[PDB]
Amino acid sequence: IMLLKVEDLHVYRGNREILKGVNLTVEENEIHAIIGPNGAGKSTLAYTIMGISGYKPTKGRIIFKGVDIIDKNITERARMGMTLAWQEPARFEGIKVKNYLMLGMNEKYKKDKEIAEEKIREALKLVNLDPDKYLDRYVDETLSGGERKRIELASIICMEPDLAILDEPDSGIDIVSFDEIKRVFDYLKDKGCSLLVITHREELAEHADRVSLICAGEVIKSGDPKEVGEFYKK
Amino acid sequence: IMLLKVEDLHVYRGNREILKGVNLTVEENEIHAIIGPNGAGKSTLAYTIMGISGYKPTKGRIIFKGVDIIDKNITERARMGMTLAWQEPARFEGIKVKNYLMLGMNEKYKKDKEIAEEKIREALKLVNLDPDKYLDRYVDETLSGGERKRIELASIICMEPDLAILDEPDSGIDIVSFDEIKRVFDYLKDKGCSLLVITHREELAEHADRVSLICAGEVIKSGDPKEVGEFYKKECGKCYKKVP
Amino acid sequence: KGPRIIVKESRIIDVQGDEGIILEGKEEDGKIKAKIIVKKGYKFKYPIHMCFGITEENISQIIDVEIILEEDSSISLMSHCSFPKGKGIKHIMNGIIKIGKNAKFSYNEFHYHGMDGDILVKPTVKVEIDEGGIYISNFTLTKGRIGTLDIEQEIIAKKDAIIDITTRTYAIKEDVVKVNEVVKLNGENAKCIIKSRGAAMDNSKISLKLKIEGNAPYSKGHIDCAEIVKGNAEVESIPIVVVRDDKARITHEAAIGSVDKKQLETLMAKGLDEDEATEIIVKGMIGDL
Amino acid sequence: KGPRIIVKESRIIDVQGDEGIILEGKEEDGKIKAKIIVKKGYKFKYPIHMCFGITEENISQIIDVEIILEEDSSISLMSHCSFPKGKGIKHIMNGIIKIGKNAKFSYNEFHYHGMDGDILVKPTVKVEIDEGGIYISNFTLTKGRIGTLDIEQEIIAKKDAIIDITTRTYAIKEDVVKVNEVVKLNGENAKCIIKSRGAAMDNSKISLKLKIEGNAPYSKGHIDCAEIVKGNAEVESIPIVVVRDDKARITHEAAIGSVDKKQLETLMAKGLDEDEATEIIVKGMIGDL
Ligand code: SF4
């Protein structure tokens, strides 16, 4: 069975629409990228599927694992195996990095202290952060913007969801090259996760299994990245 | 005579040593780019040459146009042909965009109001803003991080120094390819400026005339843009320690 | 021409109105009485104008005014005060304003004074906002001597209402400034912003009191204050916040004294010195170039 | 063992000193009298200890204490209060503290209470700081019921002096909290920080009053305040700033009410519920876990 169906979806914020008649789907073990111009509704989809406050379907329907989710809050949607990473994460006064990474940790790793402490060290090295410098620091305003965004991607590796939504995963990171990011997408797909990626990089879109183009709140074209990116360019 | 020379420079931030004896030189009409891991020396070097308060050397020298500058204040350094652009620029209560771009303008443009007026519209078109909707807006908290950064780049073009120092020049701008930025570097060099550029991207470093790599407060490599770029990709892109 | 009120030397000279708008003005017990009403559903394209002028000495003005907005209506008005050669002046005004369902109101006042320094200005205002109503106001005193200034405001608001308040001043020589204003948020989803800006010089002294009460669910409020001190002037500020509900949130910030160091260093790096840079920042704060 | 003062059942049970520091204490006129004197040039590897304990009904105790710290010297002071049975008890203390040229002082106070609410705690202190001196102070009351709490501080500082002050509280049932603190920066280059954190629930009442006066060249100050409201609790806060020099600067920041929405939604998107997510945010702010 498919992971996700979005069907005839309409959304308005204040006076007028941001999404109109959208139709979309995601398979098991798939990397799917969404592309398009700014203001086309890309982040408004990501908040609407996860169910963040102030976004609700006015018409249409959303189905996850063959079950309807419009009756469900953020906690109930997260318990089914869905999650989100924000484009610019929040800061917490008085919470340590090593305590933050234990929240929502997958039911395979969470059971034992050794297996959890090594999962945290593996996740920090995989984003190029030295564990011995960062485990005892706070998740507050004393981290730089690039450090805080690398810590949020180490959290997704510890949760290991069935579906993850990333809104600009390369924005605000001090990347040497995009081969830092593609190494994380390879690691998650190897464990069986499905990814929805919203991005402005043609370099990351080339790496997806399928790509879709959203413009002015409507889906225009989808399929092979080599067709739809070159169609979008003109 | 070299435009800038830096000799055996050390710098402290309270009880912490950050720079550990760097040596640098910049020639007339050159683009020189500095790369490496963030926080390891990149921004403190740029503040120390401009003389920004709380950034002062414990040993070494800085020589500009053959004069040793260790006694001179920010206004005296700016009078003889040096300027800085910050990573996150300041916000002003009640100052309008057409008043801000006029303030530092080069002494060859300041003498006629029509030459000053055309230079500001040329400089706004070069950074892909639309002049006639932006000139009357305030340089305040209402602007987004990408609007405020495009306005600071229009100021360097209008000010036209002998040496410009840029700290993270694309940071805060959402952009699909760097060819907007490379066009501005080419324009400044055609007018006869020299650029000192601080970055994390390889795509901007391969456009420079020379490249140097700073790690843990020291120079690790310097030379041809292409030989240092391959080392940066191969070795630094899989390193989590960030200290040799 | 348009709808208006005109007063000179404490005498009424003109008052007139369009269709859907009613204006009244007359003299009683040495005071001026005035009234304004806009009827159900009318939204107006342009402001009402009220104008005051005093060229004489030892003159006094007392005004009482009532303003009524009916359902779905919208209006704004301008106050102009010119006191050239002004000496021994008193200006006092008392306002009652009522804002109906889904209605909108905005108010502006601007003062021009000479250098002769013997002036008292004293506005007192009380306001009620019904379901979904909008209120905006602005006071500016930045040209000439202030003399003595007293501000009093009291605002009470119901559900879905919105409030936005501003004051801007510039004080010199022996000028004295007093500000006191209170907002009560008594319905769900109501919100407000309060702003003050200015600079003080010479021997002048300034006191600011600002209050918000959050009494109802989903209420929001913000206060922010900035003041620049030069010479041997003195400044005091006292912002107050109270919260009585599980679902309300209120925040505040302020900075008082000399100019911000990063703004000063940014202008020095463009070729100015401290005295050139400090005056550019002050001219921004008071609304000049 | 180490330099200490110990009291139980309103009676002194031990006072002891060490080489370079003099300690004394006695009972007079219904009060405890105590002394600490530190000799010129001495510095110590440890804190000094104060201890108070009550395990019986209807007790009232009063302490007057004087602390002298001479040139180039340093100490740290630890005080513990445990009150496991709350049946109608009074704790009152008055402190005088003097710190000399280049001296360093720090004070910590901790309270542990039971489940009964008939408690009153009343600490009062006056502090003098001479050139280049340092003052640190911390009050913590986050376990058991509070009852009624009422705190007063006055501080005066000379040139090159450093001050910082912290208080943390958690109020439940019918608890009452009041705090009143004032700092005068009278010397050149003097600096301070004032910080408060807490949460309130049930039928609790909180009032906070904080003041900085900036009177002299290159003096600097900051006030930082945050409070979380739940249930039928009420909160009031009044920060005050005064400045009287061309070269001083003071800043203030505050937030009062519910937790922030983006912080809460971020924790629910990781599979927690809203009562698990709210209590994680509170224990970080009050520094419990
Ligand atoms: S590889 Fe060497 S130069 Fe590059 S970041 Fe690591 S330690 Fe620094």
Author numbering:
A (entry chain C): 4 to 237
B (entry chain A): 4 to 247
C (entry chain B), D (entry chain D): 28 to 316
The authors write:
Biochemical and structural studies showed that SMS is made of a SmsC2B2 heterotetratmer wherein the SmsC subunit hosts both ATP and [Fe-S] cluster binding sites. With respect to the six components of the SUF system, SMS has only two components, SmsC and SmsB, encoded by the smsCB operon.
These three cysteine residues bind the cluster in a solvent-exposed hydrophobic pocket consisting of residues P40, L216, I223, Y235, and P247. Although the SmsC2B2 complex could in principle contain two such binding sites at the SmsC head-to-tail dimer interfaces, the two SmsC subunits form a strong asymmetric dimer with a single populated [Fe-S] cluster binding site. This region comprises the two-cysteine motif (-C239-G240-K241-C242-) coordinating the [Fe-S] cluster, and P247 closing the hydrophobic pocket. Additionally, residues of the C-terminal region extend the dimeric interface between the apo-SmsC and [Fe-S] bound SmsC subunit, in the vicinity of the cluster binding site. This interface consists of a cation–π interaction between the side chains of the K128 in apo-SmsC and the Y243 in [Fe-S] bound SmsC, as well as the side chain-backbone intermolecular hydrogen bonds from the N131 in apo-SmsC and the K236 in [Fe-S] bound SmsC.
